[PDB]
Design a protein around this ligand. Structure first.
Ligand SMILES: O=C(O)CCCCOc1ccccc1[C@@H](NS(=O)(=O)c1ccc2[nH]c(=O)ccc2c1)C(=O)N(CC(=O)O)Cc1cccs1
Lengths: 698, 14
């Protein structure tokens, strides 16, 4: 037959794929293969759309067919790499990309896909070089440009930052106008100066990818319950998460399933990840009424069937657009009410989510247009943490008077009070109050342990541990799986912090910092002569960039001190050494905001307009420290400078945080669960009365 | 962190 026939079907299918007509594309590809069975391009193109539909094994089969027909078919190798990467076979992906680039060194797409492996592997310098090769070969390449831009964000390379933001916004505008998937990921859109409409549109279009993967299942709509009779009057809530394990989300809410009222609620936890063997997974499996390992049910149709058979009334999406999500489960709507909660700081933009659980501080009603969901308000803040359960050894502290400071040499421990009963020369300072160990024999031995770098010592039968050696003493304590047994010593000397100056800290990933933020921090340090900035090597290759820009702003290098990433327990504990935390305005600290407040460290924040830029102020409002919340950059700076220069004020504010972390609702998981339950019932009564979702802002 | 998206290549038949 004429070659134009199969060629025309293949090329028309390519167009249909571009337009989003995936089902039509599949038909045309398969008809092309009917007309011309040995059609390498059609095999590879078909496999591309099957990949997009989640039919990964069938895609692999057709990639291999294409390559059998054409051993040097570089397109097919690069496309196959993308499928192996999605299947988590990183080595196979690399072997495919390196083969494609060996066949065709000028293959722009293959260089950019290779770069995505280096980016995910933590090799940012090599990712950057490969993205730049891709853009050299194909100067108009939105995927490469935007992922390169995020590489540069990660390492705080701000070269031509203003022009980078221009082009990012231009790319998104063009892709949205042309009905294409934006090359900016929803979770990254918060970092760039895009309109709220663009951010919600980015999210909606990423959610539509889930539709392509469920439509091939041809499942009918689910019949949903309209009463609680089958559940004996109990409301069935299902928590869906890939992060039941050693993950920050468990560090936040692992207590909540077990605190639900069993008289009125039946709790189902659907894990999207296998059991990692940590106590976090043990606890949720033991305390939930039911625990379902969906990682054993990879078909989203069969997994949604399981949710529906359990009779779930409210299904809670804890992933949003993060690693491990299976939002296909929510697209299938196995429950009549589906809510976003906690794990993802932003809107799904998707029709299959009814609510986002938030609060009036985080998401004031006047910005409801930023969200596709209806707002459902928790009464104080929607954020929560398990710090009271995980880190009770930090509820009290004592210090050593090496001369009195509350944050130069710090001891914490469960048996710390019992220990101090034995030391007759301890002094009690009332700003609860703080015991002060004088510079005696015991104190000298503790300081000798730190200076000498010993792991622990024993005094009066009490184990005293070096705070830098927790993983050698008890790995489960370092991770937060268990409460440390010993008395732990934490000191500014351990981290190179000055003994006689103000320490401002921020322990966030460096990509949450932008030039405007560092300039603001620079203005503060210039106004507090005795002061340094304490930051984290995340990643370390960002350190020289921050240092270079800080010096361009008039800050010498010795004003910024970096520490490595620490295990969870040390990370929270060493926050006690700072005087003040400077929150990132672009995207706040979220978990890290809870962490510093639990240590008693005041956090200064300037809430923005996005959900992610307003969480810290929501936390401080619940805590009851409205004076740490700035309305603009001037106020942010003035607040931080006053804290660093008026030491009586600093003592007062730190005392407020230290006390109100306990007395306010911020860390009260029992009160949170109770209020969360009241919110679920408002949702259920609303649905049971035959109403579509509406704002629950009271 | 999530996995970085990739770019599929559409092959034109000639
Ligand atoms: O809510 C927020 O504020 C942002 C959450 C973003 C998601 O993070 C993820 C995702 C998947 C797996 C694990 C994590 C982190 N766990 S964690 O409980 O948040 C933690 C544990 C130990 C730590 N030690 C330190 O010295 C400083 C911070 C720190 C944080 C993690 O272990 N990180 C460090 C690493 O991977 O090397 C990531 C960081 C977050 C903030 C600074 S680094």
């Amino acid at each position: 037959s004429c070659p134009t026939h199969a060629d025309s079907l293949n090329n028309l299918a390519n167009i249909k794929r571009e337009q989003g007509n995936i089902e039509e594309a599949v038909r045309l590809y398969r008809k092309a293969l009917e007309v011309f069975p040995e059609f390498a391009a059609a095999h590879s193109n078909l496999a591309s759309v099957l990949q997009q539909q989640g039919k990964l094994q069938e895609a692999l089969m057709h990639y291999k067919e294409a390559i059998r027909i054409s051993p040097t078919f570089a397109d097919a190798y690069s496309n196959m790499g993308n499928t192996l990467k999605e299947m988590q076979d990183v080595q196979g992906a690399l072997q495919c990309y390196t083969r494609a680039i060996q066949i065709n060194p000028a293959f722009a797409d293959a260089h950019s896909n290779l770069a995505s492996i280096h980016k995910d592997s933590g090799n940012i310098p090599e990712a950057i070089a490969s993205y730049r090769t891709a853009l050299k070969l194909k100067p108009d390449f939105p995927d490469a440009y935007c992922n390169l831009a995020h590489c540069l964000q990660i390492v705080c390379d701000w070269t031509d930052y203003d022009e980078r933001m221009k082009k990012l916004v231009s790319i998104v505008a063009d892709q949205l106008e042309k009905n294409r998937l934006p090359s900016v990921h929803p979770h990254h859109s918060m970092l760039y100066p895009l309109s709220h409409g663009f951010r919600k549109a980015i999210a909606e279009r990423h959610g539509n990818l889930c539709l392509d993967k469920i439509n091939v299942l041809h499942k009918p709509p689910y019949e949903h319950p309209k009463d609680l009779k089958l559940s004996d009057g109990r409301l069935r809530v299902g928590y869906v998460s890939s992060d039941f394990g050693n993950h920050p989300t468990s560090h936040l809410m692992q207590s909540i399933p077990g605190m639900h009222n069993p008289d009125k609620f039946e709790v189902f936890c659907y894990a999207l990840s296998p059991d990692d063997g940590t106590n976090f997974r043990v606890k949720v499996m033991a305390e939930a009424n039911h625990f379902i390992d969906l990682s054993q049910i990879p078909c989203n149709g069969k997994a949604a069937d399981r949710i529906h058979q359990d009779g779930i009334h409210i299904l809670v999406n804890m992933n949003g657009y993060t690693k491990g999500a299976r939002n296909e489960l929510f697209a299938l709507r196995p429950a009549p009410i589906q809510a976003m909660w906690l794990g993802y700081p932003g809107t799904s933009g998707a029709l299959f989510m009814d609510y986002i659980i938030t609060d009036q501080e985080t998401s004031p009603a006047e910005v409801a247009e930023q969200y596709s969901e209806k707002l459902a308000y928790m009464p104080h803040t929607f954020f929560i943490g398990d710090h009271a359960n995980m880190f009770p050894h930090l509820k009290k502290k004592a210090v050593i008077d090496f001369k009195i400071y509350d944050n130069r040499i710090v001891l914490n421990g469960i048996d710390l009070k019992a220990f101090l009963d034995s030391l007759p020369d301890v002094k009690i300072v009332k700003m609860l109050n703080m015991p002060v160990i004088p510079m005696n024999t015991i104190a000298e031995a503790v300081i000798e342990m730190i200076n000498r770098g010993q792991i622990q010592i024993t005094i009066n039968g009490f184990s005293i541990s070096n705070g830098l050696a927790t993983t050698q003493i008890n790995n489960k304590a370092a991770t937060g799986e268990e409460v440390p047994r010993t008395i732990i010593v934490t000191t500014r000397s351990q981290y190179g912090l000055p003994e006689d100056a103000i320490v401002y800290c921020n322990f966030n990933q460096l990509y949450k910092i932008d030039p405007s933020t560092l300039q603001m921090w620079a203005n503060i340090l210039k106004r507090v002569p005795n002061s340094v900035l304490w930051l984290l090597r995340f990643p370390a290759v960002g350190e020289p960039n921050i240092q270079q820009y800080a010096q361009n702003m008039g800050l010498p290098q010795n004003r910024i001190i970096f520490s490595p990433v620490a295990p969870k327990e040390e990370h929270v504990r060493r926050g006690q050494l700072a005087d003040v935390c400077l929150d990132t305005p672009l995207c706040n600290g979220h978990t890290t905001g809870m962490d510093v407040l639990w240590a008693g460290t005041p956090m200064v924040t300037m809430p923005g307009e996005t959900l992610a830029s307003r969480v810290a102020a929501s936390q401080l409002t619940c805590l009851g420290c409205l004076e740490l919340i700035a309305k603009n950059r001037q106020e942010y700076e003035d607040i931080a400078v006053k804290l660093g220069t008026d030491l009586e004020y600093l003592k007062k504010v730190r005392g407020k945080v230290w006390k109100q972390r306990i007395s306010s609702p911020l860390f009260n998981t029992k009160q949170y669960t109770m209020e969360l339950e009241r919110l679920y019932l408002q949702m259920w009564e609303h649905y049971a009365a035959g109403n579509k979702p509406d704002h629950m802002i009271k | 962190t999530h996995e970085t998206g990739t770019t599929n290549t559409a092959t034109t038949a000639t």
